[PDB]
Amino acid sequence: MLTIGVLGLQGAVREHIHAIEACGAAGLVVKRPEQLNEVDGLILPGGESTTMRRLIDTYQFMEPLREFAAQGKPMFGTCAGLIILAKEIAGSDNPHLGLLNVVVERNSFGRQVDSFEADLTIKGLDEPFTGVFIRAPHILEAGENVEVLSEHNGRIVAAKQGQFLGCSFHPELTEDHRVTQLFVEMVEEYKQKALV
């Protein structure tokens, strides 16, 4: 069976792993670069943008994450994870992987008004999905090659691009595992094409 990984350098991983298992698949808390060879897909949990950035560097994670990407292995960037996986504003500081062709802005709301829930319409899911937004990043623009999987008040909140999947909300912070299931379906689709 599949084995989804969860970059555990920073943030919480406990809930993504439960989600992956719930969908019938192994989950591994990837804490070292080499472990990336042991998984069929990777979930960038996120949490704190800037923090996770310096962490992947002192841990020689960047280059390996790109090789992971080149192998066609699926990557799911949630919340801060979305920032790592995508591109930042025009002349922003120092970008990250920049694999998901979308431009993202970091949360700008204060600690007291940075959270909320909202029923979402996600392409692939029938019944609405409840998204937990916490210091959510905002997708300012998406390339002609990314498929919009969901939108809220005109803003793209979940996008898909080939092997890449991104969303600005916390899908694992609910008991509903349908979004994690979308990624798990993406990884199996990858297993059914990877010559090994």
Curated annotation (Swiss-Prot):
Q: Name one GO cellular component term.
A: cytosol
Instruction: Fetch the CDD domains from UniProt.
Output: GATase1_PB
List the Gene Ontology MF annotations in alphabetical order: glutaminase activity; identical protein binding; pyridoxal 5'-phosphate synthase (glutamine hydrolysing) activity
Consequence of mutating E15A? Almost no effect on glutaminase activity
Result of mutating Q10A? 3-fold reduction in glutaminase activity
Alphabetically, which GO biological process terms does the record hold? Answer: glutamine catabolic process; pyridoxal phosphate biosynthetic process; pyridoxine metabolic process
Catalytically driven reaction(s):
aldehydo-D-ribose 5-phosphate + D-glyceraldehyde 3-phosphate + L-glutamine = pyridoxal 5'-phosphate + L-glutamate + phosphate + 3 H2O + H(+); L-glutamine + H2O = L-glutamate + NH4(+)
Gene3D superfamilies xref list: 3.40.50.880
Quote the annotated effect of Q10E.
Answer: Almost no activity
What EC number(s) does the entry state? 4.3.3.6, 3.5.1.2
Query: Which residues catalyse the reaction?
Result: C79, H170, E172
Q: In which pathway does it act?
A: Cofactor biosynthesis; pyridoxal 5'-phosphate biosynthesis
Binding, L-glutamine: G47, E48, S49, R106, I134, R135
Keywords of the record, alphabetical order, are: Glutamine amidotransferase, Hydrolase, Lyase, Pyridoxal phosphate
Q: Which InterPro entries match?
A: Class_I_gatase-like, PdxT/SNO, PdxT/SNO_CS
Q: What does this protein do?
A: Catalyzes the hydrolysis of glutamine to glutamate and ammonia as part of the biosynthesis of pyridoxal 5'-phosphate. The resulting ammonia molecule is channeled to the active site of PdxS.
- Please give the family membership noted in the entry: Belongs to the glutaminase PdxT/SNO family.
What is said about its interaction partners and assembly? In the presence of PdxS, forms a dodecamer of heterodimers. Only shows activity in the heterodimer.
What's the protein name?
A: Pyridoxal 5'-phosphate synthase subunit PdxT
